[PDB]
Structures are given as structure tokens and as C-alpha cells.
């Protein structure tokens, strides 16, 4: 009772709630894709290019747990490389599957099709090894089932990319289907009691001794499923709690102890002080600190920092390998109320929930928009924002509870969010078809990955594509080169993008005024994810949220 | 008298006749880019994405000698890699330049310890690398990089920290060129090679000449033309070298493509007992659609690199110089040949209605009526790559078919780069592109960049409702070979074009009304020609061989 290894892979991917398969076909993955259509539940997105496909996989994996992209040897896998790199950097389980020529007999199939010339056919594997948690290149059908299972486990558990090469000749070879009747084991190994024990007691004594602590949640908080444990910590301590831009949504923001988003130097004065004055910081799922961008500087003042991570825990300079975020937090939640004992709940910072009313002819400005979006959002929504003026603006928006944010702030691939929006939309559809996916992308970033809108159209997905037209690269104009050619772009007809890519059931509308915006976003028809929609939001050419142009004068000579 | 290292770099690129510069602005190359507008006669393309930029740079270098793309640390360089990788495979001098951060400690985008990973990666697909850390050496290093790029015609990685580009060095340096010459061979090796070849020619009952890409690429175009005049052996071209032999020469026999060639040509080559190959990329390689190899082992490969005979590599023997020595004594050595008459493709089509629906085999013949000396002809992996092989190329046609590395989307970019290079060579030199409905989706946005720089290429899009080469080699009706449907005609105005033409052609007459029209024939504005075509239609050779190869039990 036997199935192909092709079939075997997809059946395993289905058992881990992975239903949509990303990539483009090529010379050596065709038979493999044949297998998708034999598995009730699966489907082939069939993307517009391999980078967009990887970005989409990033986005799917963020919502769903993990994701799969398939490319062909050489031309394919190398096109995805930057997509994977950002996935590696922001800890996102993408399984990258690459079909390759037959391991034949003197590898004489593998060698002839290898057109790169240097006679070394492993080069592309090597290359991906650098930006993968592990790799695998199946040469042996007897080990293939357990190797695949391993590749999948590692993707889901470590939440980082994994390279898995399947030679064409092996995806048609067969195994026992019986194998599928035992699940892939995705459980975490329990912690070392000696190190856990010792971590906890160090952490409690740090709390006990602390006059002004803060809690701070980052990307891995969500990624490694510790939202509940983090909420409990906030609850049991009543400490002031913050999110970084990249774990926005990891704390339900209607919580009275939640004090908004820390963005180092771009933070609002109140929040900057709330965090920088802290004599102890409890980082959950920190995605490194003390790091810079060309627009902001992120770090804390205290050295009295406790980072929980998936792999390990960190306390001041001490490192405790195999002391795992989830279990460590669970254990802490037993003694922690008591260590918190003598904390006096200071009230904390709040952004304004609402914009004061103005004339409906009022020109749209970014500071205004980022607030007004607070009014449009509903619980369950997915909000995606591009590196740009968006990635710093959505930081002041009040999110309903149960709202996932996608903001690839650390790696900072632009155009990322177009592909991410595809993946996020496929996953939402699979999770709950009433779940809205809202994208905020600048007109300039959109050019890099524009064609993956075709692929949204093709599956009649219904994301809202909000396109901030402010005539160019407006954040890279605020730091260096205000009026250089290299931060100028061609002016596209954003409203014709959907029709041009063959959309038959869409809406496409410009908004330039406060009143235009309100008429569109309060329309109950619009508020329901009925068809795919694009909104061209017109903004001034040197506009930005207010704490960014804080640092056009006050840290640029 | 002093200039920033930045300016030195651009001043060196001008001296080598690089005028357009490719890539996207980044966190750590902005300072570098500032310099460009101060060197007169230099421009920044402003590409729509990095991969596109690399493809453009490829196209540029193919025409203008060499090229330069600037990306930024991590996000930029890695986005460009598939582009660099093909430049490496098909031997094209692209200088990849990455602005990186400035002897820092924390800025690292990834999240290991490792400032060096993306350089390690680009090493695997570069002739050399260079990560400049010290001002005193940097000019010397830049020159090596630019030299190596040009001389070897393979891409080179050049990492430039942000601190050093604003540091400053003496203008005087520019007053010496860069050494872009070779040095004649070691005459010991040359003689040994030339001799055995001349011998082999005498013994050769029926020799043949192959030009491959490195023939254009390393300037051996003319030497090939004499050699064919003197040996009057049948001459042929690889799909990668089409246009290296001007196709009017009596003894030019068309395009050898291994298992996909025209029966007459397949016969001509498979039965030679000596192959004189000028500038092979690969002798013996496969793709999904065909299989390349000669039948003799009695093969001479001339490269710039080396010379090779049967199994014997003679490192040293440079293909340009060496070929002159053969030119002399060959006149003699070969004059016991009985000139075998050379195969031909239909040079014109048979008259038919004007309502006769368009068909690939018709199109590729007809294209020959539209072309003209000086033209540039670009063909994308897919039906278009194979179709053009049938087309008759006017003298001094330059061809770009990326048939070895075979990355779809390549062309949209290469088209931009070529049109920049074209412009800088001759206003009136047209740039013509055939690309599939499906390939275009991968790289469609680089059209914006064409519009913006007021370039006027011809963009023939083959609209055959999907990936049709793919359908012919597995999955004729598979959803994965289908593609979302685009208003191709609306693509220009939608990317904000103003001086533009966009027309559909469905029928043999419609194609004629358009390509015969005199104004069309002038590179006045950017034009896009949607060519309607049956889904499963394709050059008749390739329909055969996609059946043949599926009829055998023999495998991959
Ligand atoms: C792949 C890549 N290339 C270049 C950059 C550098 N970069 C960062 S932001 C930016 C401008 C983004 O444009 P847009 O979305 O229009 O910004 P807005 O006007 O909304 O701020 C650029 C060019 C990058 N991050 N990634
Ligand atoms: C980057 C990349 N992705 C995927 C492939 C595999 N591939 C080869 S040909 C092809 C289809 C080309 O489509 P189209 O241009 O319509 O071809 P035509 O209809 O002219 O044959 C694909 C997807 C590739 N060669 N390169
Ligand atoms: Mg913009
Ligand atoms: Mg096509």
C-alpha cells in the first residue's frame, strides 16, 4: 500500500495545516507538482516570480505556523534567496523545496543540466545552507521519509527556513503510505530542571530588587506561541507592557497595563521615558537589541535585561542554553506574583484613541491617517505595513484585540509586503473567510513586487491594498538626498493595476481628503471583505508620521 | 588635487565606456551614488528592483563591453544573485558593487555573528571578490576588479564600506589607464597547438566551424570570418552565438542546437570528423527541451582563457592571438577540401490571405523581412528562443538569447540595459524583443524604467495563454503551466507612459500592415505588440523533439 515520495511530502504538509504551496514550476519539479492535485486540501498558488513567492511563503507561515515554497534548480532557488534571508532573520518557518536533476549514475544527469559551468553542482545548496536552520538533499529512498519529516519538524519547531533538495528521480519512487499514520513529532524537549530552576530564581530575585520594571514583547513572542504566557506575566505583575514594532499584536492592546510600542529613538516622549528609565526589562522573544536602521536606533539604558528566547534565556550577560521560552515562562508564572508583591502600579502612556473632527475637505496627512485607521480595524484583522513611512506610522495605531501585525522591520526588504499580503490572504481564507487582510504600502515599494497582485486576482482573494502615493521614496528622502534622482520613481496609474492584471470583480478608488477617507471606510459595504480593493491614498511629497520628522532636524546636521 | 574614492570609481567606469549605472539606492550606498551626477556623461538608471537591475546590467555589458550594478548590504545584493549567476554562466563582465557598513563594532541585517556571509555567498558566482578596508590599497584593488571584470568577462564582487567612499585620494591616478591588454602567448605552447590543429585539418575529411558566445564576447568575430573564407568549411552558430557569424556569408549553414536542429543541419554537424569551435561556453550540456554534444571527439575549443584539443587543455593559449597564427598557414593546410553545399531555412514565406491566423513557424521566417543591419535581437527562454534560430539575421545583427542559463524574466531587464547601451552607441540602432506572456510577469516592472528614460525598444509579447514550452515537455493541461491573464496593451499607459504605441496582431495580414509601415520601422517611441497565438503552437522542430524524447524509455 504505497505512494510516491512526491505524494508523501504533500500529505505531510497537509497534516501540519499547510494547504497552499508557493513557487514557480521549472525543468525539475514538474512531476512533483503533479502530486499536489492528488491531495484533497492542497493547491498551487502559481506565483508571478520566485522572490514574491518567498515573500508570500513568509507571510503564510506567520499566520499558519509554517509554509512551503518550491523552486527549480538554479534559476529558481537563487531568485528566492533574499526572501529566505529575511525569513531566516525574522525567524519564520519557510520550508524551501528545490527540485534538482537525477542523482543518476556518475551524476551524469546532474552534471549536464548544470549550466553554471564550474562543474560543482552543490553550489546552490551550499549557498542556501548559510541562511537555513538545516538542509537536506535526498539521495536515498529508504531514509527519505524520515529526512522529510525532520526537515518539516525543524521548520515548525525552530521557526527558521530549511532547504530540502528532491532529485527528480526520487519524487517518483515510492514508500509505504502506512508511514503517514504516525504524525510528525513537533513536541519540544522539556527543559533542563537544573538550568530552568536556576534561571527562574535569578529572574525572581531581579524582580524583587527592581523599583521600576517594564515588560516588552517582540517577534518570537507570537512566533513561538507565548501570547497567553506573556499576557499572564503582565496580569500577575501588573508591570507596564510594551511591544516592539515587529511583535505588534503580541499583546492585546486593550489591556490597561499596555503602554504602546517602543521604537527606540522614534518612540513618543512618554514611551521613550517609560522604557528608558526602566531598571529591569523583561524581553519576551527578543529579536536582538542595540541595533540600528538609517532612520532609528533601538536599545535600552539599563543592563538589567532578561531576554526569553525559544532556544535559551539571557540575564545580563549570562546565557542559559536549552531553557525554552514557553516552559520557562509557564514555570515563572507560579512564583512571579509573589516576587512582584511590592510593585506600585504607576499609570502608563496612551496615544489618542481618536482624531478631533475637521472639515471634510481637509487634506490627508500621515499623522492623521495613522490614527483614523484605529477606527477601521476590527478584531481578527491582519495588518501589514511596508518598511517606509508606513512601518513607523502604524506604531501609533490602536489595534483591536486578536490583531496580527506583519512589519519586516529588521531585514527591511522593500516590496516584501506585496508577497506577504498574498500569503497572509491565503492563510486567512483557510483559517476564517471573514478575516480581513489590510496592507499599507508606499507607491515606491510597490514597484519591486507589483505583479504578485495578479496572483491575488487569480484566486479571488479579497485583501485591501492601501497605496500611499507621496511621489517617491519619501523616508530615504528624510535622512539623505531630499531631491536626488535616485529617490524619484515613475508615476503609475494605481487605479488601473487590478484591471490590467485581469481583475473582473474589484474596486479601485482614490482618497485625498479627510472626508473622502471617512466616506470610504465607514461604508458598511466596503468594511466587509467582499472583493479585492485598492485605495490610492494621496499624501504630500515630504510627509511622514510626527516622531520621524522629529529626527529630520534633531539628529541630522 | 583630490577626489572621493566614490568619484574615482565612477571616473574609472567612464574611462572603460560604462555610462549607465544599475541598481537600487540603499542604507549603505547613498554616498556612493551621490558621486554619479558629478561625473558628466554618467547616469543612474533607477531600476524598479535589484534582480531586474542585474538582468539589465547583463544586457548592457553584452553590448558595451562591461557594466556596473550597485546594490546594498544583504537585501540588495541577495535580490540580484540570480542575475549575477547567469552573467557568470554565460560569461558577461558585470561589476557587482555592494555598499556595505563602515568598520562597525550590530548593524548586521541577518542574526548570526557574521558580517561576511553575503560576500561568501557571492564568491561562488564571481571571478574574484574584493572587500576594501584600507584607502591606500583601494584604488589599486578597484582597478584589478574593473580589469578582471573586462578581461575575463565574468562578474566580480566589489564591497565598498560607507566610511571609505567619502575618504579621498589623488586625481593623478586616473592619468594612467587600467591595463586592459593581454600579453602574447608563451610561443612554445602556441606553436604546439597551432601545429596539431593544422595537421588535424588536413586529416579532416569533413570539418565544420562553430561560433559560440565567447566569439563576440572576446572580440574574435573578424578572425572567425577570415578562417571561414580560407577553409570554406561549413560554418555554424550556437543559439548563444547567433549573429557572431554574419548570416549572409555563402558558407554559413544556420544554427546548430543538438537534438533540436533542422534535420539538414543536425546531419551536417553530427557527421563532421572535426569541429573548430570558436569560444564555446559549453560543449556537451542538456536542458529540459534539448541536448547538446558533437559526435566526434575530434574537437578544438578556442577560448580567451586557453586552447583545448580532444582532451588536452593548453592553459596559456589565448583565442584572439592564436587564431591569427592559424589564419596564415590554414589557407595552405585546408586546400584539399571539396566545398560541401550548406543547409538553408526558408528565406521568405508563401503568400497567403490576410485573415490567415498567426502561427509560430510563419512568424520567425517573416521577422527576417523586418530586421536590418545594426539591429539588436533579444529572445526569451520559451518558444521565442527557439523560433528565432529559423530567422535570417541581416549583417551586423547582435543577438541576446540566454539559452544556456535560461532564466525567464531575464529579457525585460536585458532589454533595458541593451537600449541604454544602444543609445550610447547610435540613436538610430533599434532594440527588438520577443518575450512570452508568462516570462514577462516575472520582470514586468522594468518597463517603467524604459518609459522613464524615454527609451524606444520594440516589445513583441507572445500571448499564447500560458507557459507553452513547458506544456510541451510535461503537463499540457496542468494548472501550474496556466497564468493569470493580463491586459498587455494596457501595460504601457498603466506604468505612466505618454509617448507610446500598443497594438494587437492576430493574423498574418495584421502583422504585415504593421511591420511594413514605414513609421513603425523607425525607433521613434516605445512600442508593445501583443502577438496572439495558439496555446500549443511552437517552432515545428521543437514540437517533434518534445514528442520523441517522451516516446523513449530513456530518462533523466
Ligand atoms: C530590496 C531593497 N532595496 C532598497 C532598499 C532601500 N530602501 C528602503 S525604504 C526605501 C523607500 C521605500 O519606498 P516607499 O514605500 O515609497 O516609501 P514612503 O514614501 O511611503 O516612505 C528604499 C529605496 C531596501 N530596503 N530594500
Ligand atoms: C526564474 C525561472 N523560473 C522558472 C523557470 C522554468 N520555466 C522555464 S520556461 C517557463 C515558461 C515560459 O513562459 P512563456 O514565456 O509564455 O513561454 P512560451 O509560451 O513563449 O513558451 C518556465 C516557467 C525558469 N527557467 N526560470
Ligand atoms: Mg512613496
Ligand atoms: Mg507564452
PDB file of C-alpha atoms in Angstrom, chain A residues 211-214 237-242 256-259 274 277 342-349:
ATOM      1  CA  UNK A 211      11.882  49.653  41.656  1.00  0.00           C
ATOM      2  CA  UNK A 212      10.673  50.437  38.076  1.00  0.00           C
ATOM      3  CA  UNK A 213      10.397  47.358  35.765  1.00  0.00           C
ATOM      4  CA  UNK A 214       8.852  47.034  32.238  1.00  0.00           C
ATOM      5  CA  UNK A 237       2.917  41.505  37.774  1.00  0.00           C
ATOM      6  CA  UNK A 238       0.792  44.482  36.596  1.00  0.00           C
ATOM      7  CA  UNK A 239       4.048  45.731  35.105  1.00  0.00           C
ATOM      8  CA  UNK A 240       3.853  48.228  32.222  1.00  0.00           C
ATOM      9  CA  UNK A 241       3.988  46.241  28.971  1.00  0.00           C
ATOM     10  CA  UNK A 242       5.272  47.305  25.548  1.00  0.00           C
ATOM     11  CA  UNK A 256      -4.929  48.591  30.793  1.00  0.00           C
ATOM     12  CA  UNK A 257      -1.226  47.884  31.534  1.00  0.00           C
ATOM     13  CA  UNK A 258      -0.177  48.055  27.819  1.00  0.00           C
ATOM     14  CA  UNK A 259       1.754  51.304  27.122  1.00  0.00           C
ATOM     15  CA  UNK A 274       8.712  54.735  30.294  1.00  0.00           C
ATOM     16  CA  UNK A 277      14.053  54.705  32.776  1.00  0.00           C
ATOM     17  CA  UNK A 342       5.787  45.216  46.336  1.00  0.00           C
ATOM     18  CA  UNK A 343       5.194  46.841  42.898  1.00  0.00           C
ATOM     19  CA  UNK A 344       3.036  50.034  42.892  1.00  0.00           C
ATOM     20  CA  UNK A 345       1.133  50.280  39.532  1.00  0.00           C
ATOM     21  CA  UNK A 346       2.207  53.597  38.034  1.00  0.00           C
ATOM     22  CA  UNK A 347      -0.297  54.640  35.315  1.00  0.00           C
ATOM     23  CA  UNK A 348       1.301  54.334  31.777  1.00  0.00           C
ATOM     24  CA  UNK A 349       1.327  56.173  28.374  1.00  0.00           C
TER      25      UNK A 349
END
